[PDB]
Design a protein around this ligand. Structure first.
Ligand SMILES: CCCCn1c(-c2ccccc2)nc(-c2ccccc2)c1CN(Cc1ccc2c(c1)OCO2)Cc1ccc2c(c1)OCO2
Ligand SMILES: CCCCn1c(-c2ccccc2)nc(-c2ccccc2)c1CN(Cc1ccc2c(c1)OCO2)Cc1ccc2c(c1)OCO2
Ligand SMILES: CCCCCCCC/C=C\CCCCCCCC(=O)O
Ligand SMILES: CCCCCCCC/C=C\CCCCCCCC(=O)O
Ligand SMILES: CCCCCCCC/C=C\CCCCCCCC(=O)O
Ligand SMILES: CCCCCCCC/C=C\CCCCCCCC(=O)O
Ligand SMILES: CCCCCCCC/C=C\CCCCCCCC(=O)O
Ligand SMILES: CCCCCCCC/C=C\CCCCCCCC(=O)O
Ligand SMILES: CCCCCCCC/C=C\CCCCCCCC(=O)O
Ligand SMILES: CCCCCCCC/C=C\CCCCCCCC(=O)O
Ligand SMILES: CCCCCCCC/C=C\CCCCCCCC(=O)O
Ligand SMILES: CCCCCCCC/C=C\CCCCCCCC(=O)O
Ligand SMILES: CCCCCCCC/C=C\CCCCCCCC(=O)O
Ligand SMILES: CCCCCCCC/C=C\CCCCCCCC(=O)O
Ligand SMILES: CCCCCCCC/C=C\CCCCCCCC(=O)O
Ligand SMILES: CCCCCCCC/C=C\CCCCCCCC(=O)O
Ligand SMILES: CCCCCCCC/C=C\CCCCCCCC(=O)O
Ligand SMILES: CCCCCCCC/C=C\CCCCCCCC(=O)O
Ligand SMILES: CCCCCCCC/C=C\CCCCCCCC(=O)O
Ligand SMILES: CCCCCCCC/C=C\CCCCCCCC(=O)O
Ligand SMILES: CCCCCCCC/C=C\CCCCCCCC(=O)O
Ligand SMILES: CCCCCCCC/C=C\CCCCCCCC(=O)O
Ligand SMILES: CCCCCCCC/C=C\CCCCCCCC(=O)O
Ligand SMILES: CCCCCCCC/C=C\CCCCCCCC(=O)O
Ligand SMILES: CCCCCCCC/C=C\CCCCCCCC(=O)O
Ligand SMILES: CCCCCCCC/C=C\CCCCCCCC(=O)O
Ligand SMILES: CCCCCCCC/C=C\CCCCCCCC(=O)O
Ligand SMILES: CCCCCCCC/C=C\CCCCCCCC(=O)O
Ligand SMILES: CCCCCCCC/C=C\CCCCCCCC(=O)O
Lengths: 295, 294
């Protein structure tokens, strides 16, 4: 009859993430757009903002579906596109964050390279490549979701359809777990280990506000993606009949909801980092630092 | 009983491609491997040759199957792997050709960037990414492939695993990712490059560029009939006579696509004679050219 507590909590988090995410990320795009033609950091934060904004658009449909006990009245096109937006957000944000991390690394260890080659056009090219690879990785996820009808009780479910549930679905879970979480975790941990050791050690090299901001965003990625990944592979290695599988499936909306916090956490981090100046001005200072002075 | 004309033609093409492909690409690997440590072009051509060599390994099985009227005696594992090696060849080849085209572009338009960043380790990293992405693209096709028993007459068939509406979109995604998008992008790329090398005397059209342009053209030339017949069959009814005709022509299309796995050495030898020596010597001059002197 009435909704379960985890689903309710997922609805609350969904609402908050929708408001803060849509308005906040839109404000970020507005602030960074004018400075995006020259400043590199502005290009980074701009792309992260667009990626977070697109995922928020799918929220009202997921909300309506959860209120209707996972009923899906939006059709097959929405079934293929709307759920996939956050997976697209996952790959796009982690790719852009990898590029930004390479930027922060090179600024610290190879200033000479950055003085000669760190231009806006290269940044836009790398961002375009990131979006391309992200969409490429998200395509199978869009193709293989279908709308199915059930009768006990009657309901219309939007879900993944793989006849080889044991063989192929586990492969999807493995690919997502590795490309989306484990590999980025390893490489970025090594990267910021190097960077932070050098920053703490040498007085001549400073910790810029941009570095602290990027570190907070990178941490937030893994923090809010962890439960969805863990439960996600766990539901590939479990029998459907098993009680553990039942529990995790009853927690699914809550995990997706926790993952969606990535789409609104960035404006919070930017504002907190910025703290006699207006909010857009604060964002403009935090998100448009020049790393290489030229004029 | 007797095979149809297209199937015999496919057998002949598979034979020629197996011989020229295995021996030629193996020799190209032998030529480029010693220099792949330092010169980047040798890395490109080495990865290309490996990709075209792997596809030929599955050729004898496909040959044997076509001789037996498309009966499949090799089982499910071979059914999932061997037919799809040509697909892995498709994706790996077009990805490597994409990075190579980006290299030919950067050499012409960004000499200064090439001076600092065109290193062997980066080229090997990009090759690793191309191979991994190619495998990742080939996996879903392999999983859908399956053995299928039939009784009138008895026979074992290897084939794809529904939803018409979904199957159409998947076929369109294959046509775009494997052909149309690479066609558009590479066309624009070499439009800029060739227009520049033609306009400016200071800019030279190097031997490596001519070779690479030839290979890139050969890709679309040989993959075209297969892509067209596939996208056509996905949008046609089985009851349709033209569908049946395309179904008969499938082996010939696979063979003509398989020419991609043996035409590369032919191109290298033709170009090497064209500039005007032992075969390995010619291949070494053509495939190990250094674009940045140090
Ligand atoms: C600057 C981001 C690099 C992404 N990346 C990571 C990467 C690192 C940290 C976090 C996310 C990705 N590991 C490897 C890499 C892996 C093996 C060998 C060589 C390179 C790569 C190289 N990738 C190709 C690429 C090149 C240039 C790009 C690009 C992607 O977008 C922006 O400009 C391949 C790739 C792309 C996305 C991936 C991934 C691998 O695993 C996790 O998700
Ligand atoms: C230099 C290779 C470029 C591949 N590519 C093509 C490409 C071009 C011509 C031929 C083949 C691939 N179009 C786009 C691209 C697409 C949209 C926006 C920005 C870039 C891309 C960027 N891709 C990332 C990547 C892949 C493989 C790599 C790599 C980076 O460095 C090493 O090896 C994503 C990608 C990879 C394979 C694809 C594809 C997209 O669509 C068709 O097949
Ligand atoms: C602080 C947390 C609460 C703040 C705002 C809550 C947003 C409104 C929640 C809507 C839930 C309505 C519902 O249960 O259907
Ligand atoms: C484009 C399709 C998605 C729309 C995303 C953002 C809309 C606004 C983007 C503004 C572009 C500014 C780019 C620039 O001026 O450098
Ligand atoms: C899938 C949606 C991805 C959308 C992300 C891209 C956002 C579009 C906004 C701007 C892109 C075009 C900006 C190109 C500026 C190039 C000139 C320059 O800055 O040197
Ligand atoms: C931070 C950038 C991550 C780059 C990962 C490269 C991995 C590799 O070179 O093997
Ligand atoms: C991995 C393969 C290529 C990525 C190399 C790292 C690129 C550094 C990006 C620097 C920048 O964003 O300005
Ligand atoms: C999806 C593809 C990403 C869309 C827009 C990214 C912007 C690409 C702009 C290319 C700029 C190249 C250059 O400045 O030389
Ligand atoms: C069918 C088109 C697939 C597009 C390629 C995207 C990369 C696929 C990689 C992993 C997906 C899981 C296996 C299916
Ligand atoms: C942008 C939204 C997400 C994009 C990812 C994949 C879209 C490309 C695959 C086609 C999905 C729709 C399939 C269909 O129309 O049946
Ligand atoms: C997909 C990427 C996931 C894992 C790739 C790990 C490969 C590690 C090779 C490192 C060797 C090296 O870079 O020198
Ligand atoms: C120059 C040498 C290395 C550049 C590597 C690109 C920056 C990312 C480093 C992260 C890592 O080492 O895994
Ligand atoms: C995200 C952070 C991940 C790894 C950071 C670990 C390196 C910490 C360096 C601090 C230097 C010190 O404490 O002396
Ligand atoms: C799948 C792995 C996920 C776990 C996180 C990875 C654990 C290792 C992380 C960082 C170890 C890197 C230590 C590098 C030391 C640098 C030495 C120096 O800077 O002087
Ligand atoms: C119950 C789980 C909720 C946890 C919320 C986590 C929010 C993540 C936000 C920021 C992570 C910590 C930021 C640390 C900044 C590091 C700056 C520096 O190292 O100099
Ligand atoms: C909602 C359940 C999880 C709790 C999430 C809490 C969200 C906000 C909490 C902390 C935000 C931390 C922001 C850190 C900004 C670092 C600024 C700096 O660089 O100094
Ligand atoms: C070696 C040349 C093989 C010729 C291929 C064409 C027809 C061969 C048919 C063999 C039947 C057994
Ligand atoms: C499967 C492919 C296995 C082997 C073929 C690749 C051989 C690579 C040799 C590298 C030689 C070198 O770089 O010095
Ligand atoms: C495997 C070793 C190399 C194979 C080379 C030629 C064998 C293929 C020719 C077989 C044709 C006759 C088979 C048959 O009649 O079923
Ligand atoms: C070593 C050979 C270098 C070839 C590099 C070509 C394409 C790399 C693909 C991803 C790098 C983005 C392009 C960087 C740039 O525009 O300079
Ligand atoms: C997006 C999926 C891409 C697949 C991941 C790539 C898998 C390859 C992993 C490691 C290979 C790295 C080896 C290259 C190191 C350079 C060696 C050298 O300098 O000689
Ligand atoms: C990116 C791939 C776009 C190709 C097809 C998407 C729309 C499919 C229409 C059926
Ligand atoms: C064939 C080239 C490599 C594939 C093309 C797509 C990747 C290039 C993306 C953005 C670069 C656009 C700016 C220069 C044209
Ligand atoms: C998607 C379009 C791909 C075709 C463009 C060529 C691909 C080359 C890859 C990267 C080149 C980016 C540099 C472009 C600016 C220099 C070229 C110019 O100014 O004419
Ligand atoms: C007939 C096949 C369909 C058309 C395919 C298009 C292929 C065009 C590709 C490259 C052509 C480049 C255009 C400029 C050529 C200039 C040559 C020169 O002047 O040196
Ligand atoms: C789609 C069709 C792809 C090819 C269409 C080519 C269109 C515009 C490219 C023209 C670029 C002009 C470069 C000038 C180089 C020079 O003259 O030196
Ligand atoms: C059949 C062979 C097709 C491949 C070669 C065809 C055209 C390539 C000609 C390009 C000339 C480059 C100098
Ligand atoms: C140049 C490759 C770009 C994509 C071409 C694919 C379709 C064209 C196929 C065959 C036509 C040959 C076009 C090559 C023109 C070479 C002109 C020259 O170098 O003299
Ligand atoms: C036997 C393989 C099939 C032969 C088909 C066509 C052979 C023509 C090859 C033309 C080579 C052109 C290379 C070049 O122009 O540089």
């Amino acid at each position: 009859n009435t909704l379960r507590v985890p689903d309710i909590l997922a609805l609350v988090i969904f609402a908050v993430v929708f408001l803060v995410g849509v308005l906040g990320n839109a404000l970020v795009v507005w602030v960074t757009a004018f400075e995006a033609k020259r400043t590199i950091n502005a290009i980074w934060f701009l792309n992260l903002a667009v990626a977070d904004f697109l995922a928020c658009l799918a929220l009202p449909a997921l909300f309506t579906s959860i209120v209707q006990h996972h009923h899906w009245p939006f059709g097959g096109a929405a079934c293929s596109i709307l759920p996939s937006l956050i997976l697209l957000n996952m790959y796009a944000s982690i790719l852009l964050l990898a590029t930004i991390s390479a930027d922060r690394f090179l600024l610290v260890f190879k200033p000479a390279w950055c003085q000669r080659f760190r231009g806006a056009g290269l940044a836009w090219i790398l961002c375009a490549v990131a979006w391309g690879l992200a969409l490429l990785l998200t395509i199978p996820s869009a193709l293989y979701r279908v709308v199915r009808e059930e009768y006990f009780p009657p309901k219309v479910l939007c879900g993944v359809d793989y006849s080889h549930d044991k063989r192929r679905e586990r492969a999807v879970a493995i690919v997502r777990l590795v490309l989306g979480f484990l590999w980025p975790l390893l490489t970025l941990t090594i990267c910021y280990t190097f960077i932070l050791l050098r920053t703490w050690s040498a007085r001549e090299t400073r910790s810029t506000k941009t570095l602290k901001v990027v570190v907070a965003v990178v941490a937030s990625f893994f923090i809010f993606w962890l439960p969805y990944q863990v439960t996600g592979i766990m539901m590939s290695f479990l029998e459907p009949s098993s009680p553990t599988f039942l529990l995790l499936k009853k927690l699914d909306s809550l995990c997706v909801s926790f993952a969606y916090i990535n789409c609104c956490i960035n404006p919070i981090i930017y504002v907190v980092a910025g703290q006699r100046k207006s909010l857009p001005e604060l964002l403009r200072e935090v998100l448009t630092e020049e790393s290489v002075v030229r004029e």
